[PDB]
Ligand binder design. Structure first.
Ligand SMILES: *[C]1[C]([O])[C]([O])[C]([O])C2=[C]C3=[C][C]=C4[C]=[C][C]=C5[C]=[C]C(=[C@@]12*)C3=C54
Ligand SMILES: OC[C@H]1O[C@@](CO)(O[C@H]2O[C@H](CO)[C@@H](O)[C@H](O)[C@H]2O)[C@@H](O)[C@@H]1O
Ligand SMILES: [Mg+2]
Length: 580
DNA sequence: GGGATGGTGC
DNA sequence: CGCACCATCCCT
């Protein structure tokens, strides 16, 4: 049953054909500056395995890799592209990426290796990566014979699966989504990850010093208020101190014991002075462990940069996620944590950070898809939509809108975006399940088109079995017909929010591609560094700021054309903190 | 190594 | 909020 192939010692002409399935294996999860353990090539002439030392030193092979006219089909081409960039080798001509294709066909499948993607088409002549390499502590690269066969089989699978996958994508009207959006985006993300973001490590260390001091003071204060020392970070030990020794009211219980959630503690603060201290303690400890030590651990000491990895094939909405580090959750609400952003700086002297963000892109997309006259008009007038919603649901004038009213209106507006139930709108507004579900009725009276959309989208999800986004991304909702209320309800909420969140994701991605193209045509040195939430972060020579102020927002606002305008705000400064 | 639990962003 | 990513605790 073994698969035939040539374990070559040298690169030959028939290995450099016009089209081929290519495997450039990087086993380490984080591929930055990581080893390439082997190379496999499958084309019309046969199947070949090449040792990286010889192949990556062969002028002809390297030329083939960088020749855009030589088309390659791969799985997770970004991984290979970045690993090669670190070795000073350019990878061009990737016309098909099986990972992205599988992701678009069904993001819920969680395809993470060739075998999983192949299984979608009843192809099983390839082993899953985990079976070949191991899980974790027992992970390792096998001997050449086993390694070569595995890489060749993955290449063979890619070679066979391209047509089948492309055919279904076309049937799904997702062929352009793959070829014109996701694949081109993959190359841009590779560039961003490789470029990295410079970190002021000295600044971070200075902050850590101050935190350790304030932390030591608070922990001691907590021990005196408790009349004893214990592991504050231990929810079990803490629970005993709070709900047994101090007899605080047990308002919330968890699976294994007492609930010590911050919102729970927030309500217990009045009962004992220790609560506020424990809250402050967790605050400080969070910044110290997660955002100071955790960040410092992933900064490359030789370049002083962090090189995140964007997971382009993970979320069910089409949004990107990032790890090592995750720059999509860096503190900003509280000033204490926000200062962390001062440690992210330009990579060159006399350069600055420029950030542009879409203003309410989710609600603008909702206005567009629902075609709600009131909501579209609201955005056409560029009104503060939370104040506007408050005026409508509460039947008051803009001058009668109180700060708390706007806050409540804001929670209602986002309810559908987040995908919360009438229950959720209560757990947030800290009101009753009935009142929470009572404002929604008032909201639908003001925005009948949104109500219509919510009813229509759920019915469409039931009829077709899935919902779609502006650029044809898809999400299957099999639970939509569940006879279990909680399960069905969640599927309905996903039916309602996916076209919103998903379309916003589509637009952001398109904007990145359009921007990258414009920056090149304009010959600007400016370049993308990060994509977080609904914003794009770049760095550029201080001399380019004025041009970027006009160029970036325009490109982002024109990415797509909706029934309402797209609005982009922007800021720039010496650090990320200064650009917001 | 991996369960449960808590916190950050939107 | 759902959901992504981390962190620490603590027992296999
Ligand atoms: C919720 C959920 O989809 C998460 O997986 C996702 O990272 C995230 C990102 C995100 C970005 C921008 C934005 C703007 C308005 C409202 C929301 C609500 C939820 C999420 C989540 C947003 C939002
Ligand atoms: O870019 C990530 C990409 O690779 C996958 C494997 O197919 O994820 C692997 O690499 C990530 C980056 O280090 C890890 O977070 C993840 O645990 C590892 O399996 C895909 O999920 C993704 O599309
Ligand atoms: Mg925004």
């Amino acid at each position: 049953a073994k698969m035939a192939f040539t374990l070559a010692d040298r690169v030959t002409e028939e290995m450099l054909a016009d089209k081929a399935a290519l495997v450039v294996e990087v086993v380490e999860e984080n591929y930055h500056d990581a080893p390439i353990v082997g190379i496999a090539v499958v084309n019309e002439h046969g199947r070949f395995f090449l040792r990286p030392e010889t192949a990556l030193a062969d002028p002809q092979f390297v030329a083939w890799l960088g020749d855009e006219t030589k088309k390659k089909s791969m799985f997770d081409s970004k991984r290979a592209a970045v690993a090669l960039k670190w070795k000073g080798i350019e990878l061009c001509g990737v016309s098909f990426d099986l990972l992205l294709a599988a992701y678009l066909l069904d993001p819920a499948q969680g395809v993470d290796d060739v075998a999983a993607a192949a299984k979608m088409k009843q192809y099983e002549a390839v082993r899953p990566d985990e079976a070949v390499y191991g899980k974790g502590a027992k992970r390792a690269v096998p001997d050449e014979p086993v390694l070569a066969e595995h890489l060749v089989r993955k290449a063979a699978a890619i070679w066979e699966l391209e047509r089948p996958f492309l055919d279904e994508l076309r049937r799904n009207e997702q062929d352009r989504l793959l070829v014109e959006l996701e694949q081109p985006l993959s190359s841009i993300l590779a560039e961003m990850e490789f470029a990295g973001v410079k970190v002021d490590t000295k600044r971070l260390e200075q902050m850590g010093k101050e935190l350790a001091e304030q932390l030591g003071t608070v922990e001691q204060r907590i021990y005196e208020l408790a009349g004893q020392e214990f592991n504050i970070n231990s929810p079990k030990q803490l629970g005993v101190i709070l709900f047994e020794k101090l007899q605080l009211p047990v308002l919330k219980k968890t699976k294994t014991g007492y609930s010590t959630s911050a919102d729970v503690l927030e309500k217990l603060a009045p009962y004992h002075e220790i609560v506020e201290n424990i809250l402050h303690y967790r605050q400080l400890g969070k910044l110290q462990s997660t955002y100071i030590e955790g960040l410092l651990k992933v900064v490359r000491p030789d370049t002083k940069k962090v090189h995140t990895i964007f997971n382009q094939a993970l979320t069910q909405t089409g949004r990107l996620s990032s790890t090592e580090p995750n720059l999509q959750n860096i503190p900003i609400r509280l000033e204490e944590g926000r200062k962390i952003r001062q440690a992210f700086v330009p990579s060159e002297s006399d350069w600055l950070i420029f950030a542009a963000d879409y203003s309410q892109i989710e609600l603008r997309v909702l206005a567009h898809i629902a075609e709600d006259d009131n909501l579209m008009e609201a955005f056409r007038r560029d009104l503060d939509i939370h104040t506007k919603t408050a005026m409508d649901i509460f039947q008051v004038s803009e001058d009668e809108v109180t700060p708390n009213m706007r806050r409540q209106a804001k929670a209602v507006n986002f309810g559908i975006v987040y995908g919360i139930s009438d229950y959720g709108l209560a757990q947030n507004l800290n009101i009753s399940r009935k009142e929470a579900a009572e404002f929604i009725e008032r909201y639908f009276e003001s925005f009948p088109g949104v109500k219509r959309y919510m009813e229509n989208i759920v019915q469409e999800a039931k009829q077709k079995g899935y919902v779609t986004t502006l650029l044809h991304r898809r999400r299957y909702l099999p639970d939509i017909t569940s006879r279990n209320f909680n399960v069905r309800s969640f599927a309905e909420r996903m039916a309602m929010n996916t076209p919103i969140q998903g379309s916003a994701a589509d637009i952001i991605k398109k904007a990145m591609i359009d921007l990258n193209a414009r920056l090149k045509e304009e010959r600007l040195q400016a370049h993308l560094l990060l994509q977080v939430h609904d914003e794009l972060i770049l760095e550029a020579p201080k001399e380019e700021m004025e041009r970027l102020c006009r160029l970036v927002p325009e490109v982002m606002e024109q990415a797509v054309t909706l029934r309402v305008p797209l609005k982009v705000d922007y800021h720039y400064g010496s650090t990320w903190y200064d650009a917001k």
